[PDB]
Amino acid sequence: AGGEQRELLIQRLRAAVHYTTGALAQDVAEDKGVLFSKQTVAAISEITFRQAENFARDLEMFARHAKRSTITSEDVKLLARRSNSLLKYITQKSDELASS
Amino acid sequence: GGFRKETVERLLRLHFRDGRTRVNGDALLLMAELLKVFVREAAARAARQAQAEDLEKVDIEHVEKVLPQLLLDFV
Amino acid sequence: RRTVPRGTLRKIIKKHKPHLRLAANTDLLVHLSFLLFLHRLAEEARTNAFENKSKIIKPEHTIAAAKVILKKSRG
Amino acid sequence: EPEIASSLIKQIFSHYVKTPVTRDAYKIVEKASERYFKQISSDLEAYSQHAGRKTVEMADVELLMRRQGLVTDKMPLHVLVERHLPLEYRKLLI
C-alpha cells in the first residue's frame, strides 16, 4: 500500500543525490587534478544515500530524547559531536544561521 | 553546488520510524551542509588514495579502500 | 570479581564532570557500556595481532585497536 | 587519581580475548579505559543537558549505547543487561 509510489520516491531520491554527488565530485576533481570514473561517482552517491538512513534515525532519537517531535539545530549539533572537526564546522554554519 | 532542501527533507522522512517526526528548516540546511561535507570528504580521500598510487583516475577500488576509515572518522 | 566498582565509576565521572549528578542505577549501565567497550577492544586488538601474524597481543596491536574502538565509542 | 582497578580490567579483557596479551599491552588497555570514561562523561553531560536535566538518567546511558551501536532494534538493552551483568546487579535494573 503506497509501495509502488514509495519505490518511485526512492528512485527519485537516489537519482537526485547522484546528480548532486556528481556536481560536488566535479568540484573536487577540479581542485585536485583528477578524474572520477562514473562508477566511483555512483558508488559515493549510494554510500551517501545509505548514510542518510542513520543520520535520520539518530536525529529522530535525539529529538525524542527532548520530548520533541520536530528536529532542530541542537539535534544536528549532537549528531556532529563524534567528529570534532565536523562539530566545529557545523556549529559555525549553525551560528551563521542564527544571526539570520 | 549543494544538496537541495526538498531532497534532504524527503531523504530524511523516508527513514524516520515515527510518522509524526519532522525536521525544521535550519536543521535541513545544516544537514545539507553535513551531507555535502560527507561527499567532498569521500571524493577527496579517494582522490588522495589514487594520487599516492600515481594515478590521475579515481576508480571504485580507491573509494572502497578509503571508505571504512571515512565512515569511522565521520559521524 | 563479580563485584561492580559503583563508587569508582561515580568518582571517575565526578572527576570529569563535578557538577554532573548521576542517578539511580545509572552507574550500572555505565559499567555495562564499559564491559562492552573492553570486549570490542579485545576483539579488535586480537584481530590486529592475527593480521600481524602474531600469536600474542602486543602494545602496537592494542594501540591501533584503541584508536579504532574509542572512535566507535563516541556518542 | 580515581580509576578502574588494573586487575578487573585484566579479568574482563582476558576473559573475552582467550589469547595471550603482554603486560605492556594491558598498560595500553588501561590508558584506553581512562580515555573511554573521559569521553562518556562528556557525552552523558551533552545528553542530559539536551533533555533539560542537570542529572544523568537511565535514558541517557541507553542513548549512549545506542549511539555506540550496542543497543539496536535487534539487541535491546535488557538483553545486554541479562547477558553481561552478574545475577545480583541485574535485579536492580529490572
UniProtKB/Swiss-Prot annotation, chain D:
It comes from the Eukaryota. It is found in: Nucleus; Chromosome, Centromere; Chromosome, Centromere, Kinetochore. Component of the CENPA-CAD complex, composed of CENPI, CENPK, CENPL, CENPO, CENPP, CENPQ, CENPR and CENPS. The CENPA-CAD complex is probably recruited on centromeres by the CENPA-NAC complex, at least composed of CENPA, CENPC, CENPH, CENPM, CENPN, CENPT and CENPU. Identified in a centromeric complex containing histones H2A, H2B, H3 and H4, and at least CENPA, CENPB, CENPC, CENPT, CENPN, HJURP, SUPT16H, SSRP1 and RSF1. Interacts (via N-terminus) with the NDC80 complex. Component of the CENPA-NAC (nucleosome-associated) complex, a complex that plays a central role in assembly of kinetochore proteins, mitotic progression and chromosome segregation. The CENPA-NAC complex recruits the CENPA-CAD (nucleosome distal) complex and may be involved in incorporation of newly synthesized CENPA into centromeres. Part of a nucleosome-associated complex that binds specifically to histone H3-containing nucleosomes at the centromere, as opposed to nucleosomes containing CENPA. Belongs to the CENP-T/CNN1 family. Association with CENPA-containing complexes may be indirect and due to the proximity of centromeric nucleosomes containing histone H3 with those containing CENPA. The largest part of the sequence forms an elongated and flexible stalk structure that is connected to a C-terminal globular domain with a histone-type fold. This is Centromere protein T. It comes from Gallus gallus. The chain holds residues 533 to 626 of 639 of the full protein.
